[PDB]
Amino acid sequence: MSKTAKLNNEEKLVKKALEIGGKMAKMQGFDLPQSPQPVRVKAVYLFLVDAKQIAPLPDSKLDGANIKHRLALWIHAALPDNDPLK
């Protein structure tokens, strides 16, 4: 299994993971808060680790960049065409 497609502007993939992870959480019976931005990113992350969508980062890699990166490769794989969101 070679790594499918390239990942350009991570920011768009993070946002799309806020969309899919946010709406999924909501429909699963939750509500992620409309708070600054990196807090919502981390909220989506916790939900996705619970949902076994991604693996838990250690407290050393529990950082805004690493969280966004988890969400990025998640949705990059989650899209069936593995689209770069460009």
Structural domain harbouring 19: 1-86
Say if residue 20 is exposed, middle or buried (CB neighbours under 10 Å; 0-12, 13-18, 19+): middle
Domain of 26, CATH number, reads: 1.20.120.1930
Say which amino acid occupies 33. Answer: P
For the chain, the domain total comes to: 1
Q: How far apart are CA 83 and CA 42, in angstroms?
A: 23
Helix extents (H) in 2-62: 10-28, 38-50
**Method by which the model was determined:** NMR
Please enumerate, as own/partner, the contacts of 32-39 that have beta carbons within 8 Å and a separation of 24 or more: 38/64, 38/67, 38/68
